[PDB]
Enzyme design. Structure first.
Site, short mmCIF file in Angstrom:
data_model
loop_
_atom_site.label_atom_id
_atom_site.label_comp_id
_atom_site.label_asym_id
_atom_site.label_seq_id
_atom_site.Cartn_x
_atom_site.Cartn_y
_atom_site.Cartn_z
N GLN A 19 -21.14 30.92 46.89
CA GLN A 19 -19.71 31.92 46.91
C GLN A 19 -19.44 32.16 48.16
OE1 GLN A 19 -19.45 35.77 44.70
NE2 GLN A 19 -21.79 35.44 44.56
N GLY A 21 -20.74 31.01 50.97
CA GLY A 21 -20.36 29.66 51.65
C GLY A 21 -21.53 28.79 51.78
N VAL A 22 -21.42 28.34 53.06
CA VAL A 22 -22.48 27.24 53.61
C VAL A 22 -23.86 27.96 54.06
N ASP A 128 -28.63 41.20 39.87
CA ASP A 128 -28.10 39.94 39.61
C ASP A 128 -29.25 38.90 39.43
OD1 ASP A 128 -26.47 37.71 38.45
OD2 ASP A 128 -25.59 37.18 40.42
N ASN A 133 -30.62 32.44 41.74
CA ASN A 133 -31.13 33.40 42.65
C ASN A 133 -32.17 33.32 43.26
OD1 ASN A 133 -28.21 34.25 43.22
ND2 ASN A 133 -28.40 35.74 41.57
N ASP A 146 -31.28 37.14 47.30
CA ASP A 146 -29.86 37.60 46.90
C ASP A 146 -29.83 39.16 46.41
OD1 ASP A 146 -28.43 35.38 48.39
OD2 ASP A 146 -28.06 34.67 46.32
C1 8E8 Z 1 -29.43 25.22 43.82
C2 8E8 Z 1 -29.32 24.48 45.04
C3 8E8 Z 1 -29.99 25.22 46.28
O1 8E8 Z 1 -31.31 24.96 46.55
N1 8E8 Z 1 -29.61 26.29 46.76
C4 8E8 Z 1 -28.16 26.82 46.67
C5 8E8 Z 1 -27.39 26.35 48.20
C6 8E8 Z 1 -28.18 26.96 49.30
C7 8E8 Z 1 -29.51 27.15 49.21
N2 8E8 Z 1 -30.50 28.03 49.79
N3 8E8 Z 1 -30.05 29.47 49.91
C8 8E8 Z 1 -30.41 30.27 50.94
C9 8E8 Z 1 -30.40 31.54 51.02
C10 8E8 Z 1 -30.46 32.64 49.97
C11 8E8 Z 1 -30.10 33.66 50.65
C12 8E8 Z 1 -29.83 34.11 51.65
O2 8E8 Z 1 -29.79 35.49 52.13
C13 8E8 Z 1 -30.34 36.71 51.45
C14 8E8 Z 1 -29.43 37.54 51.45
C15 8E8 Z 1 -30.01 38.82 50.51
C16 8E8 Z 1 -31.17 38.66 50.43
C17 8E8 Z 1 -32.07 37.63 50.67
C18 8E8 Z 1 -31.60 36.51 51.10
C19 8E8 Z 1 -30.05 33.11 52.68
C20 8E8 Z 1 -30.48 31.95 52.43
C21 8E8 Z 1 -31.87 29.24 51.27
C22 8E8 Z 1 -33.23 29.49 51.81
N4 8E8 Z 1 -33.48 30.42 52.44
N5 8E8 Z 1 -33.78 28.40 51.96
C23 8E8 Z 1 -33.49 27.24 51.20
N6 8E8 Z 1 -32.40 26.75 50.78
C24 8E8 Z 1 -31.53 27.92 50.54
C25 8E8 Z 1 -30.27 27.18 47.81
#
Ligand code: 8E8
Length: 263
Positions: A19, A21-22, A128, A133, A146
Site C-alpha cells: 500500500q 508501494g514497491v 495491525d 505483516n 510493519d
Molecule cells: C506476500 C508477498 C511478500 O513476500 N511481501 C509483500 C511484498 C513485499 C515483501 N517484503 N516487504 C518487506 C518489508 C516490510 C516492511 C518494511 O519496513 C518496516 C517498517 C516498519 C517496521 C518494520 C519494517 C520493509 C520491508 C520485506 C523484507 N524485509 N524482506 C523481504 N520481503 C519483504 C513481502
C-alpha cells in the site's frame, strides 16, 4: 543516526508492491543484504513517521524485523530493513509443498509471541498484527514487521473498506478501543491463520458479516491441525472481556508448555 545515505544502496531485485508501494532487495555498501521499502507520494504522514522511526530504530529483538534506517532527503522516502528471503508469512503458509509439521507451526507462533512480548515490554502496540505483516527469513524464522505503521497511513479506507475487521476484537469494532488486548486478539487470529495454512479468517463471510458474527459472540473454530491444547491458547485470546485475555508473557508460557508436552 536514523538516516541512511541512499548512495550506499545497490538495487538487485523487485520483491513486490504493497500500500506504501514497491519493496526491493539490494545491498548496502556493496556487501550487506537489505530490503528497501519505497513510500509512494501521498500515502503516508511522513513527518510523523520520521519522528516515530527514531523510536523504532531503538527496538531490537531477534524476532522483530530490524529497521536499519530511513532515507528522507528525497521523495519517495525509503525504509531500510533486514532482508527476509522467504517473504510474507501468509504466502509461505499457503505453499503446500512445505508439508509443514505441527511442531513447525507451533514454532512460528512462538517466534511471533516472543516479538510481541518484547513490544508489550516497551508499551509499543502493533496495531495491525496479521500473517500478511509477518516475514520469514532464509532459516524459516518468522519475525514481526510493519509494527505501528498503520498510524501513518493517509488512505482513510484503511484507518474503512480496507480496515482489518477479521483481526479486531469487539471493543475495536464497536468503540475503536485499541489496547494491548487488541493485539492479543489479533495474535489469536494469527495463530488460527498459521494452523489453517493461511486460510482467510471467516472465509465464508464478508467483513460486515464478520463484525455481526463477533457482535453476537461467535468465534473462529478449531483448525484441523491444532491440538486441543493449541486451540485452548488461541481461543483464550478471544475472551469477550478484554481484561480476561492473557498477556504475551502468559501466552509464551502456554506455548512453551505445549511444545514440551507435544515433544
Ligand atoms: C506476500 C508477498 C511478500 O513476500 N511481501 C509483500 C511484498 C513485499 C515483501 N517484503 N516487504 C518487506 C518489508 C516490510 C516492511 C518494511 O519496513 C518496516 C517498517 C516498519 C517496521 C518494520 C519494517 C520493509 C520491508 C520485506 C523484507 N524485509 N524482506 C523481504 N520481503 C519483504 C513481502
Amino acid at each position: 543516526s536514523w538516516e541512511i545515505d541512499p548512495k550506499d544502496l545497490t538495487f538487485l531485485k523487485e520483491l513486490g508492491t504493497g500500500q506504501f508501494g514497491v519493496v526491493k532487495y539490494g545491498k548496502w555498501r556493496g556487501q550487506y543484504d537489505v530490503a528497501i521499502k519505497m513510500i509512494k507520494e501521498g500515502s503516508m504522514s511522513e513527518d510523523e513517521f520520521i519522528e516515530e522511526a527514531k523510536v523504532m530504530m531503538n527496538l531490537s529483538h531477534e524476532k522483530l524485523v530490524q529497521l536499519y534506517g530511513v532515507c528522507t532527503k528525497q521523495r519517495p522516502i525509503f525504509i531500510i530493513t533486514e532482508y527476509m528471503a522467504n517473504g510474507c508469512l501468509l504466502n509461505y503458509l499457503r505453499e503446500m509443498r512445505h508439508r509443514f509439521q505441527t511442531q513447525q507451526l507451533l514454532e512460528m507462533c512462538k517466534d511471533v509471541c516472543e516479538a510481541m512480548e518484547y513490544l508489550e515490554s516497551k508499551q509499543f502496540l502493533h496495531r495491525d498484527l496479521a500473517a500478511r505483516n509477518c516475514l520469514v527469513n532464509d532459516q524459516g524464522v518468522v519475525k514481526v514487521s510493519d509494527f505501528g505503521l498503520s498510524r501513518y497511513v493517509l488512505d482513510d479506507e484503511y484507518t474503512g473498506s480496507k480496515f482489518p475487521v477479521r483481526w479486531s476484537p469487539p471493543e475495536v469494532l464497536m468503540y475503536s478501543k485499541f489496547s494491548s488486548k487488541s493485539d492479543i486478539w489479533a495474535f489469536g487470529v494469527l495463530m488460527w491463520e498459521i494452523y489453517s495454512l493461511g486460510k482467510m479468517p471467516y472465509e465464508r463471510f464478508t467483513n460486515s458479516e464478520t463484525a455481526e458474527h463477533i457482535a453476537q459472540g461467535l468465534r473462529l473454530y478449531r483448525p484441523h491441525l491444532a491440538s486441543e491444547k493449541v486451540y485452548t491458547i488461541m481461543y483464550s485470546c478471544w475472551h469477550e472481556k478484554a481484561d480476561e485475555r492473557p498477556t504475551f508473557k502468559i501466552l509464551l508460557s502456554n506455548i512453551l508448555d505445549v511444545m514440551d508436552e507435544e515433544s
